[PDB]
Amino acid sequence: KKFKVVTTFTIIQDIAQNIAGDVAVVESITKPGAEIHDYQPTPRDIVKAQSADLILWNGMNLERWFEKFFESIKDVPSAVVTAGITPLPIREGPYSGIANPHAWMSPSNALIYIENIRKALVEHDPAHAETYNRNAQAYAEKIKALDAPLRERLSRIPAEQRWLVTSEGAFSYLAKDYGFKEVYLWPINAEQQGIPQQVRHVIDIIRENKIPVVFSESTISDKPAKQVSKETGAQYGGVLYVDSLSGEKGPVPTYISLINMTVDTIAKGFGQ
Ligand SMILES: [Fe+3]
């Protein structure tokens, strides 16, 4: 039976599986579409994690459930995959000053995710070290090749008009890399107050700058974004993918597809 890796959520599953190739099985705890910040694990998840040889998670306070869940797991090592990530801080709300956990939305950060996951796989399954090393380098080259198409895809939005209005403030790392000012209805997924007041502050920012499009994301409700759309007259741009891939048969089966689809959907929103 092959070396088994279990990850907290789907983005890490797909990156690790590319590095693992056919010498290791990598599975996600959270299923596609499920909210990952305050996920409530199930009996299935304990059995799945307990059957793994290694458990990977994001850290940076992403999985608020993980440490309690990991208590119920005996004699399975865990490894965070975000060593060396430079955090962007959350700037408003009850989590101000905590790291924004969504670092994988920058493809240059994905190279660090790859290196950290390569290091963990090699450390815990050294028999397959050269497969992990070969796959990690090959996959890293795939990530590097995205920068040119992605920039070209957004090249038609003039710099002054690059406002990214979303529901969760989950795109800070992507926005910083591609010169977007970010606007959001809540800084991070959580049980929290202040969203109704922030909804009106976003409406003011949209009206002030005549921002033409707003978005929601695949693991949360589209209702706040559509309410903002109706009240401002801005177009509802659809669903961006940050916290989860789709199923393998859906439109966003891989991490590369997530970056491309999100950037494409954004550019579509500004299309004239
Ligand atoms: Fe999130």
Residue numbers in the entry: 40 to 311
Text of the article:
Yfe is an ATP-binding cassette transporter made up of the substrate-binding protein (SBP) YfeA, the ATP-binding protein YfeB and the membrane components YfeCDE. SBPs are classified into clusters according to their three-dimensional structures and the clusters correlate with the substrate specificity. YfeA is a cluster A-I SBP that binds metal atoms such that site 1 binds Zn, Fe and Mn atoms and a secondary substrate-binding site located on the surface (site 2) binds Zn and Mn atoms.
The crystal structures show how a metal can bounce around site 2 and trigger distinct assemblies of protein–protein interactions. Three histidine residues of the His10 tag are resolved in one protomer and no histidine residues are resolved in the other protomer in the asymmetric unit. The arrangement of ligands results in square bipyramidal coordination geometry, where the His314 ligand is at the apex of the pyramid and the other four ligands form the square base. Square pyramidal coordination geometry is commonly observed in protein–manganese and protein–zinc complexes.
